[PDB]
Coordinates of C-alpha atoms in Angstrom, one line a residue:
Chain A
X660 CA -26.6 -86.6 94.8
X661 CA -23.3 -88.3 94.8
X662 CA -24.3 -90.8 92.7
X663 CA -26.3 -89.1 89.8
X664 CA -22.8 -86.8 89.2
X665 CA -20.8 -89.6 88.4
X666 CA -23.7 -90.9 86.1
X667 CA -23.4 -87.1 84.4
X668 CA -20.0 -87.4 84.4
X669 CA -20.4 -91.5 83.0
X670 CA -22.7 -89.9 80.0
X671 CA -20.7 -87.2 79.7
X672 CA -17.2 -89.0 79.2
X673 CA -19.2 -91.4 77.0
X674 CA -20.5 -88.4 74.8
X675 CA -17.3 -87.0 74.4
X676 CA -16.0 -90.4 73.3
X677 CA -18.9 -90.9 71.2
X678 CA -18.4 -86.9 70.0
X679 CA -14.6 -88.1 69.3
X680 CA -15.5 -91.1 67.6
X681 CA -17.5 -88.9 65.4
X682 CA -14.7 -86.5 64.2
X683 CA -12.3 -89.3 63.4
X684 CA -15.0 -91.5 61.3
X685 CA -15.8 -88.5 59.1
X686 CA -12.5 -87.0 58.8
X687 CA -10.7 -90.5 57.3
X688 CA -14.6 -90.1 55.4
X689 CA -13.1 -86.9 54.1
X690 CA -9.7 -88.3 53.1
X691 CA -11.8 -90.9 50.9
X692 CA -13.9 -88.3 49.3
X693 CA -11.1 -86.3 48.2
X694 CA -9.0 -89.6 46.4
X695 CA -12.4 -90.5 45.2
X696 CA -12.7 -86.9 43.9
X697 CA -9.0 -87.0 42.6
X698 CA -9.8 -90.5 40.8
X699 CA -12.1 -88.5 38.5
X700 CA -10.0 -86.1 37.9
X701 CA -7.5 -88.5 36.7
X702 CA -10.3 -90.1 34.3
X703 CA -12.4 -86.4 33.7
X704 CA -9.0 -85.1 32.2
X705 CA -8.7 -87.9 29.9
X706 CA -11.9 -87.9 28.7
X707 CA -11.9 -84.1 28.4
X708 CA -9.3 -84.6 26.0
X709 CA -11.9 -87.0 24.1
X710 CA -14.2 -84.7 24.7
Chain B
X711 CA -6.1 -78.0 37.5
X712 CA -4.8 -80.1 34.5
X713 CA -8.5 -80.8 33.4
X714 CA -9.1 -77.0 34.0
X715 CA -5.6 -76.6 31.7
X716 CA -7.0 -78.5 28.8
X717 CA -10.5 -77.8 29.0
X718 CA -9.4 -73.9 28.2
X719 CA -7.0 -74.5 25.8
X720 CA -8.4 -78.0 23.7
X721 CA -11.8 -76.0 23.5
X722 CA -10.7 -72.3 22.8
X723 CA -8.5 -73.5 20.5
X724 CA -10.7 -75.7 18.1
X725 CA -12.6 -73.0 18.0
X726 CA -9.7 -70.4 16.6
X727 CA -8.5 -73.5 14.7
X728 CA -12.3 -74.0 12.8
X729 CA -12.0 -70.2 11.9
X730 CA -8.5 -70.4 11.0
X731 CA -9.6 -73.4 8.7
X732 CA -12.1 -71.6 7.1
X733 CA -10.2 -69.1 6.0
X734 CA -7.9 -71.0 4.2
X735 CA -11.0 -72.0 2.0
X736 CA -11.1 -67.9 1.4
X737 CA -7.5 -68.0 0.6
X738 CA -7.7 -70.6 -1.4
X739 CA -10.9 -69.5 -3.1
X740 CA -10.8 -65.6 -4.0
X741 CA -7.2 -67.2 -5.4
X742 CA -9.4 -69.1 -8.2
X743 CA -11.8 -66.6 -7.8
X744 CA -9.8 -63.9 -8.7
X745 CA -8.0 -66.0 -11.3
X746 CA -11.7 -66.7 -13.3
X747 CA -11.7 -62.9 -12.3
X748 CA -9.1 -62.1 -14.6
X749 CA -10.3 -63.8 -17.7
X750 CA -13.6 -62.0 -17.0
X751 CA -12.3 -59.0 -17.1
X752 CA -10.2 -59.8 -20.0
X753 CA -12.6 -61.1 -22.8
X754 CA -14.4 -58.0 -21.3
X755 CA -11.8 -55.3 -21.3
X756 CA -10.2 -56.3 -24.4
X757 CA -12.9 -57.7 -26.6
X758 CA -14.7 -54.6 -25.7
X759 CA -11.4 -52.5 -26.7
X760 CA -12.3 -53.1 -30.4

């Protein structure tokens, strides 16, 4: 039984770092959708003017 | 917000400024149109007077 813990508590500490490691790869995701989103904007208002 | 800023005012406005537009042909016409308007009338009213 001692063993098998630490094996929980081996997945489990590698989950949460996995978990983390999700966050932080989508979140600087989200911080390149929005400048690609603003990089339209910059390009959508110019050709609205054209338009 | 700037695109929303001149989608609003570039569209709404060439539409006020098409209307506007035309009505200067109106202006412009019932001007000559009232001008033929008074030589119709006249060789009417005052050939007619006789």
């Amino acid at each position: 039984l001692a063993i098998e813990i630490t094996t929980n508590s081996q997945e489990a500490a590698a989950k949460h770092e996995a978990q983390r490691l999700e966050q932080e790869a989508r979140g600087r995701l989200e911080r390149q959708k929005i400048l690609d989103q603003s990089e339209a904007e910059k390009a959508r208002k110019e050709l609205l003017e054209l338009e | 917000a700037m695109s929303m800023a001149v989608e609003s005012t570039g569209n709404a406005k060439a539409e006020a400024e098409s209307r506007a537009e035309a009505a200067r042909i109106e202006g412009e016409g019932s001007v000559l149109q009232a001008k033929l308007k008074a030589q119709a009338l006249a060789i009417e009213t005052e050939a007619e007077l006789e």
